[PDB]
Curated annotation (Swiss-Prot), chains A, B, C, D:
Role noted for this protein: Required for organization of the cellular microtubule array and microtubule anchoring at the centrosome. May regulate microtubule organization at least in part by targeting the microtubule severing protein KATNA1 to the centrosome. Also positively regulates the activity of the minus-end directed microtubule motor protein dynein. May enhance dynein-mediated microtubule sliding by targeting dynein to the microtubule plus ends.
Compartments, as annotated in UniProt: Cytoplasm, Cytoskeleton; Cytoplasm, Cytoskeleton, Microtubule organizing center, Centrosome; Chromosome, Centromere, Kinetochore; Cytoplasm, Cytoskeleton, Spindle
Record region (Self-association): 1-109
Tissue: Expressed in brain, heart, kidney, liver, lung, pancreas, placenta and skeletal muscle.
Family: Belongs to the nudE family.
Post-translational events: Phosphorylated in mitosis. Can be phosphorylated by CDK1, CDK5 and MAPK1. Phosphorylation by CDK5 promotes interaction with KATNA1 and YWHAE.
Coiled coil: 1-111
Part of the intact protein present: 58 to 168 of 345
Region (Interaction with KATNB1): 7-111
Oligomeric and partner information: Interacts with PLEKHM1 (via N- and C-terminus). Interacts with YWHAE. Interacts directly with NEFL and indirectly with NEFH. Interacts with microtubules. Self-associates. Interacts with DISC1, dynein, dynactin, tubulin gamma, KATNA1, KATNB1, PAFAH1B1, PCM1 and PCNT. Interacts (via C-terminus) with CENPF. Interacts with ZNF365. Interacts with GTP-bound RAB9A; the interaction may lead to RAB9A-dynein motor tethering.
The protein's name: Nuclear distribution protein nudE-like 1
Region Required for interaction with PAFAH1B1, annotated ranges: 57-76
Length: 111, 111, 111, 111
């Protein structure tokens, strides 16, 4: 009965000190995890920001590809209208030349 | 005087032939130049037609050069508009990279 | 003295429970923090890869752009060469006109 | 008698001056005809020369045109290469965007 009291007293003090030690590991572990979660949350913010920028980046490359398309069509068509004009000049020149052939036929008959 | 008759009649006959043959040489000529005049008139009409055609040729060349300047502008402008969209994407890319380094800085501290 | 042993035993049982639940909490928190840090370390190497890819691959666009500008500059040069030739064709033709004006007045003079 | 001798003389003198008047009409016709044929021959030679010049010069414009077409096509090849590279960039950066979405999910899950 007294033996038992003694040893209950001894186990009581052991377990109180164990509880105190663990409450302290838990407080360290906590402070730790709050700090980690701080950066996780920062990482989430910054990540979603970067994902929206990448999405804008894809949209912008698409727009550049549309403008490239337009450039290609603008140069070809502009150069095509020019050609129809030069072809009209070349055609007039071929006529000038046939008329010179007829003048030549005229002059070469002379004596 | 009789010696003189057979002589002057003999010599007026020679002149009559000379006249006859000069009238034929003049007629060769009068006919050759009649044709040449005709060719000359025709040459004048054809040279006038050819200068009018040459005038139309210069108007076409002049328009063709106008249209080529047109095509220069349309090519340069449309490609400049592409470049402005391309530069915009490239700027977006530069900014992504800057955000990723901001994020790398955040995470290098993790341990 | 019996009551005293009962009181202490019940104290000692509540302390032993508190000890198990503290150790259980510490473990489960250790394990969760551990899993968070792995995530962030993985996010670090991934960020470094993404930044290096965007650097490499933007270079490929500026390089195609370099090749575009070169081709475009050659197109302008050729356009401008062609404009010079057209200016010169115009001037030559002007001189041909004057010379045909000269033939006409000659034709008009000998007719 | 002597009356006839005078008579034949009036005819003789009348014929020498006919021969004179004819010889001079012939001379003026040759001055004239030479002037005409001279102009026609020179025109024939000038006409052939003008035809050569027009032909050489239209062939320069046509060569300049080929050269411009040559630079144009290299520009379109450049631009088509660049379209392929933008299409490749659109796909790559949509891949990266997906990676970031997957990372965001993982960061959420680990809280
Ligand atoms: Hg957040
Ligand atoms: Hg890495």
């Amino acid at each position: 009965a007294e033996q038992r009291n003694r040893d209950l007293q001894a186990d009581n003090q052991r377990l109180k000190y164990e509880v105190e030690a663990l409450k302290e590991k838990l407080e360290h572990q906590y402070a730790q995890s709050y700090k980690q979660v701080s950066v996780l949350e920062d990482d989430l913010s910054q990540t979603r920001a970067i994902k929206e920028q990448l999405h804008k980046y894809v949209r912008e490359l698409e727009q550049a590809n549309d403008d490239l398309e337009r450039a290609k069509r603008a140069t070809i068509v502009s150069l095509e209208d020019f050609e129809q004009r030069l072809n009209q000049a070349i055609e007039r020149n071929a006529f000038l030349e046939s008329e010179l052939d007829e003048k030549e036929s005229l002059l070469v008959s002379v004596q």
